[PDB]
Amino acid sequence: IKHMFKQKYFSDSTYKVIESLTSATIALWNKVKSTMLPTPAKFHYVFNMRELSRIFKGILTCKKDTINDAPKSMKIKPELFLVGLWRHEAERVLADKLVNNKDKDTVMGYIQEVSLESFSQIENEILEKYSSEKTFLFCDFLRPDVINEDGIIEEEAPKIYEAIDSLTELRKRCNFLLSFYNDRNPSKKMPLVLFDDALKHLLRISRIIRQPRSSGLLVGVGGSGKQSLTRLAGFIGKNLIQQIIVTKTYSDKDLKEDIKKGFDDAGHLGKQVTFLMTDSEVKKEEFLE
Amino acid sequence: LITSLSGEKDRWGKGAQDISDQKRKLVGNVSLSTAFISYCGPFNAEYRNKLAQQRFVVDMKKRGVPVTPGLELTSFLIDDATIGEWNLQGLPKDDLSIQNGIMVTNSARYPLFIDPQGQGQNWIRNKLSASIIPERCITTLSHPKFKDMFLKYCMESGLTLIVENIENEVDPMMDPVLERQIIVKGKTQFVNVAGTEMELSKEFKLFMTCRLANPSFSPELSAKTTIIDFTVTQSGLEQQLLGKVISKEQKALEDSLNQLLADVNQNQKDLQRLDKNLLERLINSQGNLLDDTELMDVLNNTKTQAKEVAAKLIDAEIKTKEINEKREQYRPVAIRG
Amino acid sequence: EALVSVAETFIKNFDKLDTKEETKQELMKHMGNVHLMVNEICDEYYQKMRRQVYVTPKSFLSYLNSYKTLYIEKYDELDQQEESFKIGLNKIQEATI
Ligand SMILES: Nc1ncnc2c1ncn2[C@@H]1O[C@H](COP(=O)(O)OP(=O)(O)O)[C@@H](O)[C@H]1O
Ligand SMILES: [Mg+2]
């Protein structure tokens, strides 16, 4: 964190919150790990040090310029925005695992408690702005710079990590991206409606596909919007979707070739590739291994 | 002519107002009932009443959705004749089983039956007797060549196969059929099953009979197929037995109503012809209304038919109070039985 | 809000549905509220009878489609009957005048 954000570029107040981030997340982590315990059900709940890795991975992907630009674009102090970023990234690692809505509300408390005590200087300005009800979400694709007149003629949108204030402003962008996806993939139509929770999930999936060396595991009862949102996120992400084709002839050998073509796309030539798996696509347990 | 025209005009205006009110009531009723069809199936008799008559009806009145206050489900969705038919098929007379029946006909999703004793199965066997064949239409979930012998043949032909001994867990190869996802080439409607495309006719039907008292079904399964609790219950049997006691005891009274109701439904249809006949013929006639005797006759004739219908419908309503008093008195027999 | 937001989009697709614009916004909320009340009864039904009934978002899409088809058929029958009644009433009124 000290190497990635330097003292020179940032204001004296902003860099006091940067130093606090590293001390903060640990205070939160300890409170979260001591209250949410692993059990037969909710077995994943257990928090490791990968979950501390991943929190930061989120914070360090959000660029220096975007934090200094916060007073212009987000109409808030840069020091405040930075805690806004932290809160989101802590949430996306710790809150997203949690299975029921009651266990989320408990953790949202521990994010708020900590924030207020770690960032004492901007406590009164944090407290009024940041709640579990109000939405301060982050994405890479926010920028509408992709006009898409006869394909992508006007360069591409710089994939920068920004904040969005309202879901309604987000919905217009995401709705346009969905309608465009149906135009580009005309064989496989994806009729879908993006409600408040569905938008959040799409950001959550588009975050996991974006970060380097990160895989996503989406757990839902089925028809919960898992597949549909993944193909959208992938399309918005401008990365290739690979889906296992299940036929009786197809076996463990053909999977290995389908994975091999994945590495042939990814490791070789340098294409971002998102391999997609469902319960349906796992014919046997050996494929999943 | 003035008196006849005034009466006819008043009846037509009342009918038009009733029709507009009925359309609003029908939208509310469909919202109350479709909810019943899709969701209430897997619940017992008590919980269907709780889930529809206590929850949804309360929700409607608060929201201000226009709905008919009584909205008897059985009456709205299906005709009284077709209920009569399901009784002959073997569908019991009790209130639950009628609804179970209704759900099978009206559901887009393939029905699934919970019945431990094939009462729901023995109804679906006696019905669809033309489309069902005894040999190579009924198989168990697990057969050596389930797919290629039974399933494949039944989709190709369009014959109604009935899955036997589902035993909670369903096979994943069947999933694409339950989904009704179809890759259409012309009108063949080829459906892939474990990778292999199979010609599905529109007339093909699937029925899935669970033979367990409490099966634990997966959400994916419960979403794919409408689940119907066909289980015989004490409160259910009571209403069958009460039906059988009323058919035996005070038979003459109950029969006279069943005769009257059948003759009333005729007289409604009969009146629908005469007032139609007038409309067709009052346009065709045109000028000199005062000397048009062949038309004039039916305008006076319609009023006698209308007056007759109106008198029977009052008497019908009286006989439904009569038989219901006897339904309360003979309740203790059934419930004991 | 999710279920209501899904119900909104389905009402706008529903062209043949004729009612008040105020009513449609009440229906929207009702459609969604229905799907919650079933999920609340499922949980009560597990405690009171030890029977598990699973409702999912897929079931909410299917119930809405079934309701739309039933409503369209009922509306078509009501509309044809109403049109015949209206033509008869107009002819009767002209004859009376
Ligand atoms: N947010 C949503 N908007 C529109 N449709 C949805 C949404 N979520 C689920 N669905 C519908 O439910 C079905 C579920 O499939 P999908 O969400 O793609 O994967 P999964 O079945 O794993 O949830 C889809 O066919 C889709 O039409
Ligand atoms: Mg799905």
Coordinates of N, CA, C and O in Angstrom, one line a residue, chain A residues 210-288:
Chain A
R210 N -12.7 -9.3 -13.3 CA -11.7 -8.2 -13.7 C -10.4 -8.4 -13.0 O -9.4 -8.4 -13.7
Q211 N -10.4 -8.6 -11.7 CA -9.2 -8.7 -10.8 C -8.3 -9.8 -11.4 O -8.8 -10.9 -11.7
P212 N -7.0 -9.6 -11.5 CA -6.1 -10.6 -12.0 C -6.0 -11.8 -10.9 O -6.1 -11.5 -9.7
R213 N -5.8 -13.0 -11.4 CA -5.8 -14.3 -10.6 C -6.9 -14.2 -9.5 O -6.6 -14.1 -8.3
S214 N -8.1 -14.2 -10.0 CA -9.3 -14.4 -9.1 C -10.4 -15.2 -9.9 O -10.7 -14.8 -11.0
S215 N -10.8 -16.3 -9.3 CA -12.0 -17.1 -9.8 C -13.2 -16.7 -8.9 O -13.0 -16.3 -7.7
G216 N -14.4 -16.9 -9.4 CA -15.7 -16.6 -8.7 C -16.5 -17.9 -8.6 O -16.5 -18.7 -9.5
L217 N -17.1 -18.1 -7.4 CA -18.1 -19.2 -7.1 C -19.4 -18.5 -6.7 O -19.5 -18.0 -5.6
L218 N -20.4 -18.6 -7.6 CA -21.7 -18.1 -7.4 C -22.6 -19.2 -6.9 O -22.8 -20.2 -7.6
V219 N -23.2 -19.0 -5.7 CA -24.1 -20.0 -5.0 C -25.5 -19.4 -5.0 O -25.6 -18.4 -4.3
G220 N -26.4 -20.0 -5.7 CA -27.8 -19.7 -5.7 C -28.7 -20.9 -6.0 O -28.2 -21.9 -6.6
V221 N -29.9 -20.9 -5.5 CA -30.9 -22.1 -5.5 C -31.1 -22.6 -7.0 O -31.3 -23.8 -7.1
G222 N -31.0 -21.8 -8.0 CA -31.1 -22.2 -9.4 C -32.1 -21.4 -10.1 O -33.3 -21.3 -9.6
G223 N -31.8 -20.8 -11.3 CA -32.6 -19.8 -12.0 C -32.5 -18.5 -11.3 O -33.4 -17.6 -11.5
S224 N -31.5 -18.3 -10.4 CA -31.4 -17.1 -9.5 C -30.7 -16.0 -10.3 O -30.5 -14.9 -9.7
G225 N -30.4 -16.2 -11.5 CA -29.8 -15.2 -12.4 C -28.3 -15.4 -12.6 O -27.6 -14.5 -13.1
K226 N -27.7 -16.5 -12.1 CA -26.3 -16.8 -12.0 C -25.7 -16.8 -13.4 O -24.8 -15.9 -13.6
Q227 N -26.1 -17.6 -14.3 CA -25.6 -17.9 -15.6 C -25.7 -16.6 -16.4 O -24.7 -16.0 -16.9
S228 N -26.9 -16.1 -16.6 CA -27.3 -14.9 -17.4 C -26.3 -13.7 -17.0 O -25.6 -13.3 -18.0
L229 N -26.2 -13.4 -15.7 CA -25.4 -12.2 -15.3 C -23.9 -12.5 -15.6 O -23.2 -11.5 -15.9
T230 N -23.4 -13.7 -15.5 CA -22.0 -14.1 -15.8 C -21.7 -13.8 -17.3 O -20.7 -13.2 -17.5
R231 N -22.6 -14.2 -18.2 CA -22.4 -14.0 -19.7 C -22.4 -12.5 -20.0 O -21.7 -12.1 -20.9
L232 N -23.2 -11.7 -19.3 CA -23.3 -10.2 -19.4 C -21.9 -9.6 -18.9 O -21.3 -8.9 -19.7
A233 N -21.6 -9.9 -17.7 CA -20.3 -9.5 -17.0 C -19.1 -9.8 -18.0 O -18.3 -8.8 -18.2
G234 N -19.0 -11.0 -18.5 CA -18.0 -11.4 -19.4 C -18.0 -10.5 -20.7 O -16.9 -10.1 -21.1
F235 N -19.2 -10.3 -21.2 CA -19.3 -9.5 -22.4 C -18.9 -8.0 -22.2 O -18.2 -7.4 -23.0
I236 N -19.4 -7.4 -21.1 CA -19.0 -6.1 -20.6 C -17.5 -6.0 -20.4 O -16.9 -5.1 -20.9
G237 N -16.9 -7.1 -19.8 CA -15.5 -7.2 -19.5 C -14.6 -7.3 -20.7 O -13.4 -7.0 -20.6
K238 N -15.2 -7.6 -21.9 CA -14.5 -7.8 -23.2 C -13.5 -8.9 -23.1 O -12.3 -8.7 -23.5
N239 N -13.9 -10.1 -22.5 CA -13.2 -11.3 -22.3 C -14.0 -12.5 -22.9 O -15.2 -12.3 -22.9
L240 N -13.4 -13.5 -23.4 CA -14.0 -14.6 -24.1 C -14.7 -15.6 -23.1 O -14.0 -15.9 -22.1
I241 N -15.9 -16.0 -23.3 CA -16.6 -17.0 -22.5 C -16.4 -18.4 -23.1 O -16.6 -18.6 -24.4
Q242 N -15.9 -19.4 -22.3 CA -15.9 -20.8 -22.7 C -16.8 -21.6 -21.8 O -16.7 -21.4 -20.5
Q243 N -17.7 -22.4 -22.4 CA -18.7 -23.2 -21.7 C -18.5 -24.7 -22.2 O -18.6 -24.9 -23.4
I244 N -18.3 -25.6 -21.2 CA -18.2 -27.1 -21.5 C -19.5 -27.5 -22.2 O -20.6 -27.1 -21.7
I245 N -19.4 -28.2 -23.3 CA -20.5 -28.9 -24.0 C -20.6 -30.3 -23.5 O -19.7 -31.1 -23.8
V246 N -21.7 -30.7 -22.9 CA -22.0 -32.0 -22.3 C -22.7 -32.9 -23.3 O -23.8 -32.6 -23.7
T247 N -22.0 -33.9 -23.8 CA -22.5 -35.0 -24.7 C -22.0 -36.4 -24.1 O -21.0 -36.3 -23.5
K248 N -22.7 -37.4 -24.4 CA -22.4 -38.8 -23.9 C -21.0 -39.2 -24.4 O -20.3 -39.9 -23.6
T249 N -20.6 -38.9 -25.6 CA -19.3 -39.1 -26.3 C -18.2 -38.4 -25.5 O -17.2 -39.0 -25.2
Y250 N -18.5 -37.1 -25.1 CA -17.6 -36.2 -24.3 C -17.3 -36.9 -23.0 O -18.3 -37.3 -22.3
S251 N -16.1 -36.9 -22.5 CA -15.6 -37.5 -21.3 C -14.5 -36.7 -20.7 O -14.3 -35.5 -21.1
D252 N -13.8 -37.2 -19.6 CA -12.7 -36.5 -18.9 C -11.5 -36.1 -19.8 O -10.9 -35.1 -19.5
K253 N -11.3 -36.8 -20.9 CA -10.2 -36.5 -21.9 C -10.6 -35.2 -22.7 O -9.7 -34.4 -22.9
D254 N -11.9 -35.1 -23.1 CA -12.4 -34.0 -23.9 C -12.4 -32.7 -23.0 O -12.0 -31.6 -23.6
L255 N -12.8 -32.8 -21.8 CA -12.7 -31.7 -20.8 C -11.3 -31.1 -20.8 O -11.1 -29.9 -21.0
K256 N -10.3 -32.0 -20.7 CA -8.8 -31.6 -20.6 C -8.5 -30.8 -21.9 O -7.7 -29.8 -21.7
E257 N -9.0 -31.2 -23.0 CA -8.8 -30.5 -24.3 C -9.6 -29.2 -24.3 O -9.0 -28.2 -24.8
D258 N -10.8 -29.1 -23.7 CA -11.6 -27.9 -23.6 C -10.9 -26.9 -22.6 O -11.0 -25.7 -22.9
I259 N -10.3 -27.4 -21.5 CA -9.4 -26.6 -20.6 C -8.1 -26.2 -21.4 O -7.8 -25.0 -21.3
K260 N -7.5 -27.1 -22.2 CA -6.3 -26.8 -22.9 C -6.5 -25.7 -23.9 O -5.6 -24.8 -24.0
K261 N -7.6 -25.7 -24.6 CA -8.0 -24.6 -25.5 C -8.2 -23.3 -24.7 O -7.9 -22.2 -25.3
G262 N -8.6 -23.4 -23.5 CA -8.7 -22.2 -22.5 C -7.3 -21.6 -22.2 O -7.2 -20.4 -22.4
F263 N -6.4 -22.4 -21.9 CA -4.9 -22.0 -21.7 C -4.3 -21.6 -23.0 O -3.5 -20.6 -23.0
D264 N -4.6 -22.2 -24.1 CA -4.2 -21.9 -25.5 C -4.7 -20.5 -25.8 O -4.0 -19.7 -26.5
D265 N -6.0 -20.1 -25.3 CA -6.5 -18.7 -25.5 C -5.9 -17.8 -24.5 O -5.5 -16.7 -24.9
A266 N -5.7 -18.2 -23.2 CA -5.3 -17.4 -22.1 C -3.8 -17.2 -22.0 O -3.3 -16.1 -22.5
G267 N -3.1 -18.2 -21.5 CA -1.6 -18.2 -21.4 C -0.9 -17.8 -22.6 O 0.0 -16.9 -22.5
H268 N -1.3 -18.3 -23.8 CA -0.8 -18.1 -25.1 C -1.7 -17.0 -25.8 O -2.9 -17.1 -25.7
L269 N -1.1 -16.0 -26.4 CA -1.7 -14.9 -27.2 C -2.2 -13.7 -26.3 O -2.2 -12.6 -26.7
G270 N -2.6 -14.0 -25.0 CA -2.8 -13.0 -23.9 C -4.2 -12.5 -23.9 O -4.4 -11.3 -23.8
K271 N -5.2 -13.4 -24.1 CA -6.7 -13.1 -24.1 C -7.2 -13.4 -22.7 O -7.0 -14.5 -22.2
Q272 N -7.9 -12.4 -22.0 CA -8.7 -12.6 -20.8 C -9.8 -13.7 -21.1 O -10.6 -13.4 -22.0
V273 N -9.8 -14.8 -20.4 CA -10.8 -15.9 -20.7 C -11.5 -16.2 -19.3 O -10.8 -16.4 -18.3
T274 N -12.8 -16.3 -19.4 CA -13.7 -16.7 -18.2 C -14.3 -18.1 -18.5 O -15.3 -18.1 -19.3
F275 N -13.8 -19.1 -17.9 CA -14.4 -20.5 -17.9 C -15.6 -20.6 -17.0 O -15.5 -20.3 -15.9
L276 N -16.7 -21.0 -17.6 CA -18.0 -21.0 -16.9 C -18.4 -22.5 -16.6 O -18.4 -23.3 -17.6
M277 N -18.8 -22.8 -15.4 CA -19.3 -24.1 -14.9 C -20.5 -24.0 -14.1 O -20.6 -23.0 -13.3
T278 N -21.5 -24.9 -14.3 CA -22.7 -25.0 -13.5 C -22.8 -26.5 -12.9 O -21.9 -27.3 -13.3
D279 N -23.8 -26.8 -12.1 CA -24.2 -28.1 -11.7 C -24.4 -29.0 -12.9 O -23.9 -30.2 -12.9
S280 N -25.1 -28.5 -13.9 CA -25.5 -29.2 -15.2 C -24.2 -29.7 -15.9 O -24.2 -30.8 -16.4
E281 N -23.2 -28.8 -16.0 CA -22.0 -29.0 -16.8 C -21.1 -30.1 -16.1 O -20.3 -30.8 -16.9
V282 N -21.1 -30.2 -14.8 CA -20.4 -31.3 -14.0 C -21.3 -32.6 -14.2 O -22.2 -32.8 -13.4
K283 N -20.9 -33.4 -15.2 CA -21.6 -34.7 -15.5 C -21.2 -35.7 -14.4 O -22.0 -36.4 -13.9
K284 N -19.9 -35.7 -14.1 CA -19.2 -36.6 -13.0 C -18.4 -35.7 -12.1 O -18.1 -34.5 -12.5
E285 N -17.9 -36.2 -11.0 CA -17.2 -35.5 -9.9 C -15.7 -35.3 -10.4 O -15.1 -34.3 -9.9
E286 N -15.2 -36.1 -11.3 CA -13.8 -36.1 -11.8 C -13.5 -34.8 -12.6 O -12.4 -34.3 -12.5
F287 N -14.5 -34.3 -13.4 CA -14.5 -33.0 -14.1 C -14.2 -31.9 -13.2 O -13.3 -31.1 -13.5
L288 N -14.9 -31.9 -12.1 CA -14.8 -30.8 -11.0 C -13.4 -30.8 -10.4 O -13.0 -29.7 -10.0

